Amino acid sequence: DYPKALQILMEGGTHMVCTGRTHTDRICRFKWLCYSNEAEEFIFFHGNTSVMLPNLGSRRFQPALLDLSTVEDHNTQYFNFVELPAAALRFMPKPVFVPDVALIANRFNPDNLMHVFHDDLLPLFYTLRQFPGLAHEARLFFMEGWGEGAHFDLYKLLSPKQPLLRAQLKTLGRLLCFSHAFVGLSKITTWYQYGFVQPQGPKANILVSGNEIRQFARFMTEKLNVSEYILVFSRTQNRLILNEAELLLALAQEFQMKTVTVSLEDHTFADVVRLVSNASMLVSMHGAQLVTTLFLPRGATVVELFPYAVNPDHYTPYKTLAMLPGMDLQYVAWRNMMPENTVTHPERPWDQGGITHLDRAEQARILQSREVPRHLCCRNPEWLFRIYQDTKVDIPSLIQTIRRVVKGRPGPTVGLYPGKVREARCQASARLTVSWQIPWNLKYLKVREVKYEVWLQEQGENTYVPYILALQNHTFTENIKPFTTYLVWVRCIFNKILLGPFADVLVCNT
Amino acid sequence: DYPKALQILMEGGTHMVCTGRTHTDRICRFKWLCYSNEAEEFIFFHGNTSVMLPNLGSRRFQPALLDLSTVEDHNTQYFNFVELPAAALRFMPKPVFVPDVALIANRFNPDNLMHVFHDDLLPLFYTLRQFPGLAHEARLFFMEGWGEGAHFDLYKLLSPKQPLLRAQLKTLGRLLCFSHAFVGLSKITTWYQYGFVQPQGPKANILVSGNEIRQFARFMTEKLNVSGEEYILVFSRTQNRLILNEAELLLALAQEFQMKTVTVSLEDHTFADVVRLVSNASMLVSMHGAQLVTTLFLPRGATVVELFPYAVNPDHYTPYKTLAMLPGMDLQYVAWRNMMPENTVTHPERPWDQGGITHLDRAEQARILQSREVPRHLCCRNPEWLFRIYQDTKVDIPSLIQTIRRVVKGRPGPVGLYPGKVREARCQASARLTVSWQIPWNLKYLKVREVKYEVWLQEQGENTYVPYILALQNHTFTENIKPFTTYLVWVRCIFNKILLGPFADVLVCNT
Amino acid sequence: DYPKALQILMEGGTHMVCTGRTHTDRICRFKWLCYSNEAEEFIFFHGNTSVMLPNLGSRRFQPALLDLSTVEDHNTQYFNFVELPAAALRFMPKPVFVPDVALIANRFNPDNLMHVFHDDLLPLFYTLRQFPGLAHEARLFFMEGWGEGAHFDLYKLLSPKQPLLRAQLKTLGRLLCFSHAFVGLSKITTWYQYGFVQPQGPKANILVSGNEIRQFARFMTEKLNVSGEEYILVFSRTQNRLILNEAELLLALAQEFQMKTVTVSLEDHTFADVVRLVSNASMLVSMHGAQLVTTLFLPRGATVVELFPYAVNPDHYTPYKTLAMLPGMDLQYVAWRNMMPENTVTHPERPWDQGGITHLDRAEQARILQSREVPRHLCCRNPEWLFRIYQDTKVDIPSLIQTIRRVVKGRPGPTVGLYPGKVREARCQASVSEARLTVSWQIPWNLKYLKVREVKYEVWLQEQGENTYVPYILALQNHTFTENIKPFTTYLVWVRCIFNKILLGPFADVLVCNT
Amino acid sequence: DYPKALQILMEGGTHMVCTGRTHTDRICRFKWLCYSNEAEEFIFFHGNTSVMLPNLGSRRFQPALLDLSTVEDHNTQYFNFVELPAAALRFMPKPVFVPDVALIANRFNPDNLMHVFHDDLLPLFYTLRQFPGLAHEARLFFMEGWGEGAHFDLYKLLSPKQPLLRAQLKTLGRLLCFSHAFVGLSKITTWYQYGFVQPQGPKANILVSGNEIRQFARFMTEKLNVSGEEYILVFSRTQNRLILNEAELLLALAQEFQMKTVTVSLEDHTFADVVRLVSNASMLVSMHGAQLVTTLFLPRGATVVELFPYAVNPDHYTPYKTLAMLPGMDLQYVAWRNMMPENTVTHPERPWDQGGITHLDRAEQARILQSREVPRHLCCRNPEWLFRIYQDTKVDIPSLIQTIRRVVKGRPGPGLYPGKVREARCQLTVSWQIPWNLKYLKVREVKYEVWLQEQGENTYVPYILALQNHTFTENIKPFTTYLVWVRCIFNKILLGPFADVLVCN
Ligand SMILES: [Cl-]
Ligand SMILES: [Cl-]
Ligand SMILES: [Cl-]
Ligand SMILES: [Cl-]
């Protein structure tokens, strides 16, 4: 009923329970959270059942309750509400109730394919799957206040319900109340930051592997109803490969493989995914189209071309993605280092990398610069000048660079850690004997190389002495002193690089 | 079906999606998470749908994926699993499937009422309410490996399903798989830390208010079927940590406050009776101890009087003080300290766990008996703390009554909203800087006693800000304002001196 | 059959299996061990079943296989045999077979009641009870070559079979063979040595308690057909070593201790009467001598008052003191010494063997009469010892009563003494700002079923490397060491339980503990 | 009856009477000795007939009352009880009574044939025969807490009653009481010590001869129902410690000693078959190992040939040498040592218990492979000893045959002391009658040793005479006192006892 709902709200109030310690990792589950289209402001109504966990009091504004976006820009990211007593509904319009459960988020830039996938789609995908029901029942509300933008068709693949924008809320009524709303997006799937504080680069601690990216890739291919060769990403407008035709022959010749071109302009996104999905190698100028890297099969190679004066190590979103553990991709960066081979466009508008709007002394400085200096966001004019350059690729130079990584023809465990060693014993005679059972999970496992690392510290000292043994039982003779206390740590190693957990330390007396 | 479930698991694998940046704030939602009773070890099975978000690789063991307990003791807190390929189920016993959705947690100390409420019940209550369904459908699994303990009846009030302990899992089969399990507990409702690293005291950043405590109190009263004549309630103890002069105190209080006085006891009353009595008490008097956690059931306006024995400094032991003084709890708190050794009775001949000291060297016993105040200390079983906390106490009535009266003038017994942003902030420079703004939107529907505006003025470049508290929506800055300069201007609304609202978008103003 | 037995022996041979590492503690079980009365020599016959365990080869003669007596005099004590092939019986007389199982021992001095009980009866009693059957079936053979002597009636109480002496063996035939013989006597029940090597005194390591003495006492009372009004019993002597003032002493004692007083005498009473009287006496007063060995018949709680004549130091002559003060005997012991020469009567004109001295140099006679204390000495019949021990004595009653009263305050007359088990499940544990070592244990298993007045625990604490132990007596099962405990050190911790200060239990396995 | 037994115990108590001065040589006869399966502890109940001889008080724990094992390892060896008043049975479970007489002992290692025979079977055999009845009536209780182990069939040959292990006691009830139990084992039949304190080797003073070993051998053959054509018997091994050239050795021996040659194997034969074969062998050839303890079954006159692998020194490992050379065993013993490294095969990759060394630091592995002789060592599983003892061996036939031939010239195959001299007279002229037992005896060489000490000095002057009468002239001084001892000697080495000293002036 409406008169039922309106009383639940009028006496009960808003109910907020959020997971996370800080605003950076917070996702809030609300009941009877309301939105004034007049005020353009979310509303928490204090009633007699009303709960606000966390209760930050005035730290709610330092800087905000929640991040609506994954992109830490100190602006679109922030969600906050404004407080009223539920009583005050009497002096206010009649609420319109949103009945179906909502996920309320912000899109940083729904015109850019990298932003769309990295910032929005992968987060939305796994944020929905954090809370039971949401995935198949939730309607997305985008409150940042952009239109559908160039890639809305992709957003629409996440819920089976039509997402709403802020513009569309204005029409629905002057006062909206969500019966059940989640607000915020996990940042767990992010790997890159666009340089708001220090210059752009990979996140310090990446918590997503290839596996979880591929599982999202599977879902997106199937929802695009789309289920050997080198694939070259073309651009028709700007940031061109001036010698496309030469490159297509050179690659075909060098790698003994068919070569296709694909274009975001000239193909449905479904076609792009169909083509990227079975490509053995993907060649592209640095740009948003390379985020389709996440659709490449295991074994494929990414070749990223950078124009004159743009240093590949300063611009590593697609490098970072390709080199994630479990992505099983190879990555090559090639840099145009020959000024004869670049075409600049200084007469263009400022937003397309033009420089005629600047002092003549700055224009000079920019044209003399052989490398774009490191910089903060956003729209740095030297970065734009260079990134909107058209490029003649030096084929011999490209092929050398690819060949340093791809020896032979390009194209096609899960990586389990061991358990603790069990029942670690030690024993003296000066001889120290240490023994242990295999880790429990090893019993049900075939692993090529299985070693045990044993650390030996004389209590008092900080010197550790490592040993890699193959057997479950070893007797230390060398450097072992009588009437001494030894601390002994032990861990199992799969295939040299998968280090398992250490068992409880052993105290051993000689 | 079983053969259905077993295939979903055998080819699909375990699916893990967790909220939170570190192991400290992580709660994980699992599908087809399994537990070997042989190995005493949770199992993640890698299949072809299997997801592990976060994927920490080897940082999963530094120190763990999750905290199972709210109590950061670096031991019971830690949840981890061991990895297999789903394939490997063929070489392994037949799974037993837990069909109903599970919440898997650890209890720090289910024998202590403070630990039970603070560490377990309030966290369980609000962790369940984080995820849709869980509250009314979830079966709790306690993996720490205690028995029911003294307060299991209270745990049982949270789910309508019988909670299971680790001992009971062993019987169910050699290999358990949860179709749907949440693991971990929010620490958001905690207000105290028991001194594992630095000495015990309140959490530095408490994120729970009286509102959220009371809403949990309502739920627990209703589940205990328990819902002119006002009274003072005195918590008695029959075993140890006695008030030697109970009868004297009951008369003194009655006389001083003109109010009936009842005693209640955890030993001599069902917990439902305790809550019935605490629920309508105008004042609650108790020696420091777990029984005082029932403070959270007191009505708005009531007073807590906490008595500390000889050599125990109230400010070193503040769990019940912290709870009573939480914003929106609307309780008053008094600490009284026994300062007179003639009024204490020590018990040094008792077992170590009841504060005895005869188990120590003779020189330590001396040191302890000579000590006039328990020195600050880390967890846990500090022998001087136990010696003093298990003292019986003759309360100096005149001293108690004076102490209460410094806080409770008259008879004991029966807002909080922040402003919005100021709107449409304008500035204008004629050197004179004029700044103006509309009231915050929510002020329109609000009656607040004192409403001020704070204006910060920063010359762009400098880190000097210059604050001003105005009453009016319009001010003109005169001296100190330089011509041909850029000023940044922040503005926020303040309710009743202490409720600081958010700052509006900065203004850039040029002179 | 005889022709059966004779073949078993003629082809089979002697069979010897003995318990013990040395001749001092050896008891041998023989089959077809033989004795030539002509040669005065035991014979081991090597046949085709014949066994000799131990096989000492030539160490059999260094000095002997076995001790026949408990008394280490290096002579009567020794048992040995001589070897022949069983074949050689053909060139030798017809064996006479002893059919019943034998115990073959030597008696050191069967004319002396102390020697009889200490050396022979208590050993025979418990040696018989070492081997199943023997007690009720064994005939004793005494090979030392004394007659019955003054106390044969007592020997006869041990087996229900008439013991045989060496004299009687000579008649039986020129060649005897025991079908089944035990040889030797346990020394386990001995508490005294008569000073063959160093001067007489208690054995250094006594392995018998009151319990095992009393159980032998019970047996001997029952075999003697003997089992407000409490009394003091005074052992009199009619011949020598007299109390000259008996009548005075009997009144003085009666008066002082408010108790009837009886006299008893080995000469004037059947041994059964002596035991009847000693068995219920609250106090036993006697001159030092063999009659005081009847001390072993006193009830729990009684007091022994031993009188020594002039110049005899009680601490030099402690067989009856040692017996009375054995654990579990629960007797009190008083020694009184005649200190006043006016109160002794010497007898220097008697034969040398009864303490006479006229057979010595006149300078030695002088030296002996001038001597105020018999100097310590070796066995046997030292002439100063005999001169003084055969003295008659007027007892100084005031002096005696003072001496008794130092021990018997109030009226004279009326645990088992169990050791604890190991402490169990001994744990230890450290802290991490200052070093604290916690040690705990469960009570010993047997404590569960036991009420003991004082129960303490002794804990020894050794820093590994040092030899310094540091002891502690605790009352509780759980202690935390703070003092002198160093961080980053290894401590060895021993723990034992103590009942009533003096019953020290076994140590548990050592704990290694790290700080 | 049960209610009879229970009263005898409840009022009477435990009764203990033991033979021996120390714990090393003690055997105890108990009545109403009890065992708590809960406490894992024997119980002495003090009643009113109760006897405890010896009463060591607190020396009962220094270190123990008794040795349960013959093997002095300071652990399995020790038997002790815990004391209660018989009264306390009221607060305790209902006793289960063992009615038949018991012998309670510990087995050191019932998986090893040498340990089984040397430590357990021979001791049990002669311990039972120390006390009348026991042999034919006793049930053995093994409290060490091993299973039956590989040789239980042999233990079962001693009593006619099924021996019990500690595991099986737990089932019988919470509280067991033996009506009649002997506890401990004679060490009198032991000849070897396995090196717990000083390195392994023969006991310094061996108190058992071949006679007593053979009498035990006869008993064990009869209980195994096993009782021109002569032969050499070679002990083969299938698993480890192999003779790599068995076939060559069997032909060489056959040809050299003109004699059939059989192989036997503990794996491929019932122990009864092994004894059947060893019992009539003229020569027994084996690698050093437990199988050679079957030496005690060889006939009088047979030869034992013990082969030691590379770097194992025969003189450091002498249990079978010691056994073979016991007086009255009438065996010949040959030790051969593999001296040639080309003729050994090591197995360092095997598990540690089969002589592997891959579990050690790399510098120890080096040290071990460089070593030409296993250094002397204490018990137990020394890794160099194991490395070498699990070697397979190609036997140098010429070298072996040389070694055997130093002792067996021709074909292989098939001790009384005197009495005292009597009536010793002196006058320096000294005379004596023959020892009594000499009258009934034919001895090849019969000499007399006379010691001559001038009273005061400690110088003795020995003389070996053939006649019963001699006159000393040399170094004899007038107006002196001489002490004269005299003993008879059979065949140079059997020294008889000395007669009573003579004083001669
Ligand atoms: Cl779902
Ligand atoms: Cl709900
Ligand atoms: Cl008997
Ligand atoms: Cl027999």
Curated annotation (Swiss-Prot), chain A:
Domain of life from the UniProt record: Eukaryota
GO molecular function annotations of the record: acetylglucosaminyltransferase activity; protein O-acetylglucosaminyltransferase activity
Pathway where this protein functions: Protein modification; protein glycosylation
Residues carrying sugar: 48, 225
Membrane disposition: Single-pass type II membrane protein
Keyword Transmembrane helix: yes
Parts of the chain on the Lumenal side: 1-510
Record-level GO BP terms: neuron migration; protein O-linked glycosylation; protein O-linked mannosylation
One of the Pfam families matching this protein, by short name: Glyco_transf_61
Cellular component terms per the entry's GO annotation: endoplasmic reticulum; endoplasmic reticulum membrane
Catalytic activity: 3-O-(alpha-D-mannosyl)-L-threonyl-[protein] + UDP-N-acetyl-alpha-D-glucosamine = 3-O-(N-acetyl-beta-D-glucosaminyl-(1->4)-alpha-D-mannosyl)-L-threonyl-[protein] + UDP + H(+)
Tissue distribution: Highly expressed in the brain, muscle, heart, and kidney in both fetus and adult. In the brain, highest expression in the cortex and cerebellum. Highly expressed in the pancreas.
Sorted UniProt keywords: Congenital muscular dystrophy, Disease variant, Dystroglycanopathy, Endoplasmic reticulum, Glycoprotein, Glycosyltransferase, Limb-girdle muscular dystrophy, Lissencephaly, Membrane, Signal-anchor, Transferase, Transmembrane, Transmembrane helix
Chief subcellular location: endoplasmic reticulum
EC number from the UniProt entry: 2.4.1.312
Compartment annotation: Endoplasmic reticulum membrane
Residue stretches making up the Fibronectin type-III domain: 424-510
First-tier enzyme category under EC: transferase
Keyword Transferase: yes
Family in the record: Belongs to the glycosyltransferase 61 family.
Disease implicated: Muscular dystrophy-dystroglycanopathy congenital with brain and eye anomalies A8: An autosomal recessive disorder characterized by congenital muscular dystrophy associated with cobblestone lissencephaly and other brain anomalies, eye malformations, profound intellectual disability, and death usually in the first years of life. Included diseases are the more severe Walker-Warburg syndrome and the slightly less severe muscle-eye-brain disease. Muscular dystrophy-dystroglycanopathy limb-girdle C8: An autosomal recessive muscular disease with onset in childhood, characterized by limb-girdle muscular dystrophy and intellectual disability without brain malformation. Disease severity is highly variable and some patients may be clinically asymptomatic.
Function: O-linked mannose beta-1,4-N-acetylglucosaminyltransferase that transfers UDP-N-acetyl-D-glucosamine to the 4-position of the mannose to generate N-acetyl-D-glucosamine-beta-1,4-O-D-mannosylprotein. Involved in the biosynthesis of the phosphorylated O-mannosyl trisaccharide (N-acetylgalactosamine-beta-3-N-acetylglucosamine-beta-4-(phosphate-6-)mannose), a carbohydrate structure present in alpha-dystroglycan (DAG1), which is required for binding laminin G-like domain-containing extracellular proteins with high affinity.
Protein's name in the database: Protein O-linked-mannose beta-1,4-N-acetylglucosaminyltransferase 2
Organism: Homo sapiens (Human)
Gene expressing this chain: POMGNT2
UniProtKB/Swiss-Prot annotation, chain B:
Recorded topology in the membrane: Single-pass type II membrane protein
Occurrences of domain Fibronectin type-III (ranges): 425-511
Record: glycosylation sites: 48, 225
Tissue: Highly expressed in the brain, muscle, heart, and kidney in both fetus and adult. In the brain, highest expression in the cortex and cerebellum. Highly expressed in the pancreas.
Metabolic or biological pathway: Protein modification; protein glycosylation
Reaction(s) catalysed by this chain's protein: 3-O-(alpha-D-mannosyl)-L-threonyl-[protein] + UDP-N-acetyl-alpha-D-glucosamine = 3-O-(N-acetyl-beta-D-glucosaminyl-(1->4)-alpha-D-mannosyl)-L-threonyl-[protein] + UDP + H(+)
EC number: 2.4.1.312
PROSITE patterns associated with the record: FN3 (PS50853)
Role: O-linked mannose beta-1,4-N-acetylglucosaminyltransferase that transfers UDP-N-acetyl-D-glucosamine to the 4-position of the mannose to generate N-acetyl-D-glucosamine-beta-1,4-O-D-mannosylprotein. Involved in the biosynthesis of the phosphorylated O-mannosyl trisaccharide (N-acetylgalactosamine-beta-3-N-acetylglucosamine-beta-4-(phosphate-6-)mannose), a carbohydrate structure present in alpha-dystroglycan (DAG1), which is required for binding laminin G-like domain-containing extracellular proteins with high affinity.
Family: Belongs to the glycosyltransferase 61 family.
Associated clinical condition: Muscular dystrophy-dystroglycanopathy congenital with brain and eye anomalies A8: An autosomal recessive disorder characterized by congenital muscular dystrophy associated with cobblestone lissencephaly and other brain anomalies, eye malformations, profound intellectual disability, and death usually in the first years of life. Included diseases are the more severe Walker-Warburg syndrome and the slightly less severe muscle-eye-brain disease.
Protein name from the UniProt record: Protein O-linked-mannose beta-1,4-N-acetylglucosaminyltransferase 2
Gene for this chain: POMGNT2
